[PDB]
Amino acid sequence: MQTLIIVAHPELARSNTQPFFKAAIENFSNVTWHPLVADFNVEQEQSLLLQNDRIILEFPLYWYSAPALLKQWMDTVMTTKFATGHQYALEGKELGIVVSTGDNGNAFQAGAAEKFTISELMRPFEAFANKTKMMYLPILAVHQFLYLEPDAQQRLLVAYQQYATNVG
Amino acid sequence: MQTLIIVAHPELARSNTQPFFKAAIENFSNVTWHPLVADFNVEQEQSLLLQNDRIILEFPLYWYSAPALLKQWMDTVMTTKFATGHQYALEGKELGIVVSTGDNGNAFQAGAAEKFTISELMRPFEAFANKTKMMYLPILAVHQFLYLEPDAQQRLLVAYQQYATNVG
């Protein structure tokens, strides 16, 4: 199984969370780690999607949604012609989400501070997977990673490895 | 009451729908029609927010969410320091959404093609409003505006005028 990780952090070099995560998958030759540039090439992006079986979108939660960089990728790479129309290029591929927040995970539920679960906030991606006939994975939510103890951090890193590689 | 309309159509100059909406509020001097440009200035945008009581975000639905330029404005204009922190600049302001789709409104519900309502898809904006202590207005969803009969177009435009100006 080939996995493409689309990494959409508009300040990736400054991220302190992402380094632990690249390190966790560096040794899996079937995993393509692919950070976006603002001027990404559509044809190249489409080519990579075609070559992979599990597509993972990896990003920080910015005001309860993906960063503008990922939104631009969605709006320009996922054309009607490619993603739907009479190609449905993504049909049968798996879509996963690795979303990181500074907030405690317990904030994201009814009656708690943010009122809404991560599932509910990620609905646009779920809708996308349904539309494009992809198989939507449970979301890997990464909460307060940099505040966690070493052993808690390691358990999330192991979950991430499995998210990228476990067939699936 | 002063209203600011953030017009985040990514190809505004070409849009066939937006001139209808601009024309509809042209006579209300307390309504500010504010196209979002690719090179917006944070300070000027923050200034406009501070000067208005009702903030309406007006955009087409692109893959079940706002266009990337609006997300960029959210990411950059709505800083921790401004929108939360010790300032909460938006506290008490109303947040409205005028979201247009090329799909029939009836696709957006459980059991239909899109499975999720517009309310569910706009959840990140509701969570933003909650976080920043804004009052979230019911969403004005605009489905297939250009296809509507002249009389239905006119009715929707009256609802739009009320949405922008009705103090209630």
The CATH number linked to A6 is 3.40.50.360
Query: Residue B65: CB partners within 8 Å, gap ≥ 6?
Result: A65, A71, A74, A124, B71, B121, B124
Among the partner-chain residues B10, B63, B74, the one whose CB lies closest to the CB of A124 is B63
Q: What's the resolution in A?
A: 1.8
> Could you tell me which of B130, B112, B55 has the C-alpha nearest to residue A114?
B130
Q: Would you tell me how many other CB atoms lie within 10 Å of the CB of residue B2?
A: 13
- How far is B46 from A120, CA to CA, in rounded Å? 29
Q: Are B134 and B93 in contact (CB under 8 A)?
A: yes
Q: How many CB pairs under 8 A join A and B?
A: 79
φ, ψ dihedrals at A142, nearest 5°: -110, 105
Task: Report the structure determination method.
Answer: X-ray
Task: Kindly tell me the burial class for residue A63, based on how many C-beta atoms sit within 10 Å of its own C-beta (0-12, 13-18, 19 or more).
Answer: middle
How far from B96 is each of A110, B4, B126, B136, B162, CA to CA, in Å?
23, 10, 10, 6, 12
Q: Are A6 and A73 in contact (CB under 8 A)?
A: yes
Which residues in chain B have their CB less than 8 angstroms from residue A62's CB? Answer: 71, 74-75
Among the partner-chain residues A71, A114, A130, the one whose CB lies closest to the CB of B68 is A71
> Could you tell me which of A47, A125, A129 has the C-alpha nearest to residue A94?
A129
- How far is A119 from B5, CA to CA, in rounded Å? 30
DSSP letters spanning A23-64: HHHTT-TTEEEEEPPTT--HHHHHHHHHT-SEEEEEEE-BTT
A124 touches chain B (CB under 8 A): yes
Q: Are A115 and A107 in contact (CB under 8 A)?
A: no
Q: Are B139 and B97 in contact (CB under 8 A)?
A: yes
A16: domain range? 2-168
- How far is A22 from A8, CA to CA, in rounded Å? 13
Contact check, Cβ <8 Å, B121/A116: no
Give the HSE-up count for residue A12: Cα atoms under 13 Å, Cβ half-sphere: 17
Looking only at Cα atoms, what is the longest distance across chain A?
49
φ, ψ dihedrals at B71, nearest 5°: -65, -40
Which residues, listed in sequence order, are joined to residue A59 by a DSSP beta bridge? A99
DSSP letters spanning A156-168: HHHHHHHHHHS--
B155 touches chain A (CB under 8 A): no
Q: Are A120 and B123 in contact (CB under 8 A)?
A: yes
Among the partner-chain residues B69, B121, B127, the one whose CB lies closest to the CB of A64 is B127
Q: Would you tell me how many other CB atoms lie within 10 Å of the CB of residue B137?
A: 15
- Domain total for chain B? 1
Q: Report the SS3 class of residue B99.
A: strand
Q: Chain A 17-46, CB below 8 Å of chain B: which residues?
A: none
> Could you tell me which of B83, B63, B64 has the C-alpha nearest to residue B73?
B83
- How far is B5 from B52, CA to CA, in rounded Å? 10
